[PDB]
Amino acid sequence: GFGCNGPWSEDDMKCHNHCKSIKGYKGGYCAKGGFLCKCY
Amino acid sequence: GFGCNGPWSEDDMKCHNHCKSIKGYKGGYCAKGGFLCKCY
Amino acid sequence: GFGCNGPWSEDDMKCHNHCKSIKGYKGGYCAKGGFLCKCY
Amino acid sequence: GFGCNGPWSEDDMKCHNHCKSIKGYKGGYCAKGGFLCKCY
Amino acid sequence: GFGCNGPWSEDDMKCHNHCKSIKGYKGGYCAKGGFLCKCY
Amino acid sequence: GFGCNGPWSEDDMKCHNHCKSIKGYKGGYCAKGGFLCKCY
Amino acid sequence: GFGCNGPWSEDDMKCHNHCKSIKGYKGGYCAKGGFLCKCY
Amino acid sequence: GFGCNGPWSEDDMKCHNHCKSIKGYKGGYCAKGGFLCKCY
Amino acid sequence: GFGCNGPWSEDDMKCHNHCKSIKGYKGGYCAKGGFLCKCY
Amino acid sequence: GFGCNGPWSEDDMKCHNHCKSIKGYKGGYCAKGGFLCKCY
Amino acid sequence: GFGCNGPWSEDDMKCHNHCKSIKGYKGGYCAKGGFLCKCY
Amino acid sequence: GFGCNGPWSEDDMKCHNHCKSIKGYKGGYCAKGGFLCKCY
Amino acid sequence: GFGCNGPWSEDDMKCHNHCKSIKGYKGGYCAKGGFLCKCY
Amino acid sequence: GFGCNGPWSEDDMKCHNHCKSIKGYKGGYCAKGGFLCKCY
Amino acid sequence: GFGCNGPWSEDDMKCHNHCKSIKGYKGGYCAKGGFLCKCY
Amino acid sequence: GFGCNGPWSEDDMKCHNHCKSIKGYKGGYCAKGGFLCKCY
Amino acid sequence: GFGCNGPWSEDDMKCHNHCKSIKGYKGGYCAKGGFLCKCY
Amino acid sequence: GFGCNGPWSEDDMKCHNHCKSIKGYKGGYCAKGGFLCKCY
Amino acid sequence: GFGCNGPWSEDDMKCHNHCKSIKGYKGGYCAKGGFLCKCY
Amino acid sequence: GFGCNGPWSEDDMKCHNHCKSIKGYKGGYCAKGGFLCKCY
Amino acid sequence: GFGCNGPWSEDDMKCHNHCKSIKGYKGGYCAKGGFLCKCY
Amino acid sequence: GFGCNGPWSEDDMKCHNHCKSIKGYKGGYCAKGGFLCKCY
Amino acid sequence: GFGCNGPWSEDDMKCHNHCKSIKGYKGGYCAKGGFLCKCY
Amino acid sequence: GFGCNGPWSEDDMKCHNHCKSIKGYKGGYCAKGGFLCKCY
Amino acid sequence: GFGCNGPWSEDDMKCHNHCKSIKGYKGGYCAKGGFLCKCY
Amino acid sequence: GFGCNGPWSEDDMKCHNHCKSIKGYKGGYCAKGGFLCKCY
Amino acid sequence: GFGCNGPWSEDDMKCHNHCKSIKGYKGGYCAKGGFLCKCY
Amino acid sequence: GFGCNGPWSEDDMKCHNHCKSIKGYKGGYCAKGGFLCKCY
Amino acid sequence: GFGCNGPWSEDDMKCHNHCKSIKGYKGGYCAKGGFLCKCY
Amino acid sequence: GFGCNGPWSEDDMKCHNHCKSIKGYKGGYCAKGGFLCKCY
Amino acid sequence: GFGCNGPWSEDDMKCHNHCKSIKGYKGGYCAKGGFLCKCY
Amino acid sequence: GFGCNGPWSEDDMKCHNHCKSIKGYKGGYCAKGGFLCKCY
Amino acid sequence: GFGCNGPWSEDDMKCHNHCKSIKGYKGGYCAKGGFLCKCY
Amino acid sequence: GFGCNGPWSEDDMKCHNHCKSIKGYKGGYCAKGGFLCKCY
Amino acid sequence: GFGCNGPWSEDDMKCHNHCKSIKGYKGGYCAKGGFLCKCY
Amino acid sequence: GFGCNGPWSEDDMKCHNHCKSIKGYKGGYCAKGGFLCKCY
Amino acid sequence: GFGCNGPWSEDDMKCHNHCKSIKGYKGGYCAKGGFLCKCY
Amino acid sequence: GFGCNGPWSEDDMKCHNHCKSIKGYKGGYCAKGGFLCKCY
Amino acid sequence: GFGCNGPWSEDDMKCHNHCKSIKGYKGGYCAKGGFLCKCY
Amino acid sequence: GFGCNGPWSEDDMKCHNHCKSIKGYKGGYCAKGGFLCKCY
Amino acid sequence: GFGCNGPWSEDDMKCHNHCKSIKGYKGGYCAKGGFLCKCY
Amino acid sequence: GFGCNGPWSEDDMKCHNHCKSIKGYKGGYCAKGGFLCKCY
């Protein structure tokens, strides 16, 4: 979710913005090979 | 299943919500390249 | 993000250019196995 | 970048050719475990 | 080919059978990051 | 092209046969994460 | 466009031919998970 | 195979269970950089 | 296994925690070049 | 763990900082050939 | 380059054959920890 | 080559067989720190 | 071989056990600077 | 740390420069078999 | 064996402790230039 | 042990200090050609 | 540094050349058991 | 240099051949405990 | 050379055979403190 | 040879046993200053 | 200690200087066959 | 058992699969004149 | 008996299980051409 | 008789029990292809 | 298997054809006394 | 035919008598494992 | 088929007659243990 | 004939007795692989 | 006879026991390729 | 194949005739102990 | 052929008689280790 | 006996184990061309 | 044993491996005319 | 012939008796390596 | 091995070809009386 | 005869004993290259 | 090779003819005691 | 006798040991060209 | 050839007669130690 | 013994080693015309 | 000829008797080193 | 040795070449009557 959809991912930075919106994280990326929004 | 349908999937969080509803899982994502709801 | 999408990355130097645009970095690469634009 | 994409890297010699195009370098290789084109 | 399709691969043994059809090989796996049937 | 269509790819050997039809190549596979027929 | 329509894409080589018709490109493929004709 | 699929590998212990099912092996791991289930 | 997946491994301490859960081991690490959870 | 991941290790000094945070140690390094954070 | 790709290296003798093709060298190997074809 | 791949090596006897295929040698090992098949 | 892999060698007594399996030897150690299982 | 990563060390004199930057030392080297920056 | 691994050996006293555990020996050390645990 | 590791010995005087810490000895040195801490 | 990296050291004569470049020295070698370029 | 690398030295006669190539010397050996090619 | 490598020597008879290949000598030993094959 | 290796010689009676195995000799000792097994 | 390390001693007069620094001695040498700094 | 039934046997691979489920065997055949699955 | 009924035999392992239930036998098979359960 | 009725034979052990009831026989089986109780 | 069934084997060349279908083999025969199809 | 029916063959000597009734043969037997009356 | 029905087959010569009716065959018999009419 | 029926032979010495009953022979056995009573 | 039945022979030692029961013989074996009990 | 079936082979000259039918061969025989038709 | 069938050869002197029946030969024997009737 | 059955022999070590069980014999083998267990 | 079975032997290396499992032997062959594994 | 069958010869003196029965000869032996009765 | 099987050896040049495949040998022959492939 | 059978000869001393049983002879041996018992 | 097979060699002149076919040789004979075709 | 069997002789020291067992002889050898154990 | 076969030579005077049949020679003998018919 | 076997001898150095195992001898040769190991 | 066969000569005085049977000679001996009956 | 085998010696210059390989010798010949390679 959050825009992590492998080759069909849209460039909206949705995962990054969603992870930033949570306190304690500075960003996010599509883990599980591009299909799981994970916050780092 | 649970909205994991590759490019036709909707950002409904249906997989995520369904996986959260089961005790012991923090969430879910669309494994098998976007076609299988899997709980993590 | 920034074009780091594993096997589906489009060879556009998007991560590298994005990292250069930030002062203090001379480039970037796709860390986390190709899925996280990281500036070095 | 420059074709350094871990397991999905192609054998195009793109990193090597790019590094040769810069004066003072004999070639290049994919450092950071195959994900960062580095000139030597 | 032979069922090596990255995240969309199935445990269909097509690569294994194809490799067994050649003298000297005991199996196959999906090289090139999951997209090329390779005999070992 | 040549049947490289990601999850909707049919194991038709079209990429493989097309690449073998060019002298100097042993075969082909679906690079770019399953969407580009590439000869090796 | 140019025949890049995901699962409903035909094998007409339309994207490849269109990309060849532009000087400076060797061919094309359906990026964005099979829905955007992109020249390389 | 057997759940060894690089970044798209799941944490299902599928390779480990498959290798334990062969009497005499302790377990298995994903060799060849995460793409070949190998028993030990 | 247990999160040991080379470059795609997550800093989940999953191997370490799993190895601690077995009596007699202080921890674990990803041997075989990052792909085999081994308890020490 | 703690950033000790062989060639894919990130330069965040995570192992060193983690070992310093434990009373009795002045630092740490990646033993086992770069894959086990060990405090000295 | 030339098939030196760490854990994802294929035993294709590409580095060896390439190095033998240059007069004065008996062969080659993957230096830099498996990521740089070097002739000896 | 011949299965000498540092931490990612497997006990596949490729180096041993390659060395046995030459008169006078009784085996082989991975020299250059585990990256070069050397006959002894 | 047989677990003699320099810094990446595990403490599994693999070389020792292999050498003891050859009737008449007391044990083995990693000669050639840790890279050759040698029986004594 | 500080660029001491065994075979994957990037030839940047990072350990040496880091050790020189500390008063009382004239250099440094990768001890512990190449994995620990140590100042002398 | 028993932690005798040349430059990569850890000050674990593993050889010493193992040799003490056998009746008649006061301790052990890494003979063969640091690669063979020998009890004295 | 105790820092007696031939050419890889560190200059920490570990053997000397260890031997001094035992009642009845005034020092120690690396006997057995630099590989056995012996108290005198 | 200067190519002194134990078993992974290349035969580039880098330490020797570097030591010659300093007035008053005839050459250099890898002291500290192969890990410290030292001029003589 | 010239193959004098302590325990990781290969019996390649490189030191010997190099020293014989200089007029006035019968051969060479690895002095400094195996780490410096010296002509005699 | 010829297997004379100080503490890392093996009873490989290389020095003995090399010396037997010269008229008048009945064997060889490792002179220069174990680092030079010398015929007697 | 035969355990005559100067300071690195072990107390294993290897030279003595080797010399006794030659029918007619009483024993052996390490001549040439500890580096040549000589029977008497 | 103090630079008495047999064949691996670095020609630094370290033992001699250390012994001179103690009142009542005019120098020192490496006794015990080169492995014990002894003041005379 | 396992499909070994003399003249009434079928090429059902039951014996082969049963034998493959045991470490070390590469197949099976119907011994005892076609009535006993035997692993080879 | 025990399911040994020639062509009408069912692969029920009844003969095998019955024979294993008797101490001293590894298994059983249908002797007499498929009509007599015999323990081996 | 005695339950030997080919495919319609029941698993009543009737033939075996009947044959045991006669002194001098260890058991019985359905000979004549499953239709004649015969004592052995 | 593959038509190797002792006296009940048919003259259908089934083993031979099966072995020829494996590219690189000339044919096959019924080893193990007529009960194991073996390729040559 | 002619009474050659494997385990269901009746003892009427039908094959033998039939073969004797043909001029040039002295008898017959059930070849093909008991299913083909063949005259000898 | 053609009267090959195991124990229920009738001595009708139906398989034999049918096989004779096809040019090139001398006769037929009930292979597969009496259940398949096969022409020879 | 005479009880020579391969695996379905009933252990009745029928062939042997039949052959003894003919003058000039001392016994018989099942030749042709168990399917032809032959007198010797 | 006496259990000599080629591949269908059981391990009952029947031929050996029968041959021992005749005075003047030490045992027996299945001659004629496994089909004739012969005393020696 | 071609009637070579060990003890169950028929004197059909099938191997001999088949081998004669191929130009350059005088005949054939049953090699591999009677189980492989080989042309000479 | 002609009765030359290794251990299953019948004593009918078939090879000898067959060879005598050909003009120019006085007999025959089973060459190729008992499997080829050869006329002398 | 003891598993010596020519081509139908199973590598069960039965002859070897039986012969070792008799004092004075190192082992056994299948003499008489594979049909008689003989102790040596 | 160990695959030494006269004319029915296969090049299975069982004798070779068995002999290699004993100190001092470099191989094995089938002595006693092809029926006894003998180490040399 | 006459009992000369290599390893399968039955110790019956058949060749010797046959040769004695011919006037002018005092015996016979199995020439041609055990496969041809020859009178001397 | 390698086609050296005494009288059952075939004229296939298998030993010769095997020995030539080992670079440096001219050919091979069947030593040990025809049962051991030996290279020269 | 008398146990003289070339490579298949047993060590029964049969030829020697037979030759001793004739007055005037001290023993016997297998002449004609191991195939003819001859008294001396 | 070429018919040189000791006692089992046939007077086929195969070695002689083969040696004549090579320019410069008058003929050949079976050296190595009858087992190696050698051209003179 | 005593292992003297020409080319098929096994280096079992049987002749030597047998001759030493007789008082007055130092040993034995295979006279008569390798076929008669003779004491010297 | 021509009956010159060392210890297996037959007394047929074949070499002598063959050499006499050639004009210019009065006889022949087995040179090369009994293995080459040579005319004198 | 010790490899002295006339024309069937191999250059195996068994005689040489046996003679070297006795004080005072420098080698051995095959006396008695090639059949007795003799030390010189 | 005439019993002159080097080490394999049978002590029959055959050469001597043959030479005496020719008028003008009083005996014969095995010239050419034991391989040619020559009359004197 | 080295091709000195009396009458069975070949003209291969093996003794001569072996003696020339020992630096300082001109050649060799077969002393001891043709059975000992002696260098001069």
Author numbering:
A (entry chain 5), B (entry chain 7), C (entry chain 4), D (entry chain S), E (entry chain 3), F (entry chain 6), ...: 1 to 40
What does the paper say about this structure?
Plectasin consists of 40 amino acids and shows well-defined secondary structural elements in form of an α-helix (M13-S21) and an antiparallel β-sheet (G28-A31; V36-C39). The structure of plectasin is stabilized by three disulfide bridges (C4-C30; C15-C37; C19-C39), which is typical for this type of defensins and leads to high conformational stability. Plectasin contains a cysteine-stabilised α-helix-β-sheet structure, which remains intact upon fibril formation.
We were able to determine the structure of the plectasin fibril at an overall resolution of 1.97 Å (local resolution varies between 1.9 and 3.0 Å) using cryo-EM, which is one of the highest resolutions hitherto achieved for a protein fibril in cryo-EM and allowed an unambiguous structure determination. The structure consists of two coiling protofilaments, which form a right-handed superstructure (mature fibril). Each protofilament has an axial (C2) and a helical symmetry (axial rise z = 25.20 Å and a helical twist phi = 15.75°). The repeating or asymmetric unit (au) for each protofilament is composed of seven monomers. The PPI42 protofilament is stabilized by a hydrophobic core in the centre (red spheres) and hydrophobic interfaces between the monomers (black spheres). The assembly of the two protofilaments into the superstructure is favoured by the interaction of the loop between α-helix and β-sheet of monomer 1 and 3 in each asymmetric unit with the two symmetric monomers in the other protofilament. The (G24)1 and (K23)1 backbone form three hydrogen bonds with the (K23)3 sidechain and backbone and (S21)3 backbone which stabilize the mature fibril. The interface between the two protofilaments was calculated to be 722 Å2 per asymmetric unit, which corresponds to a small interface area for protein complexes.
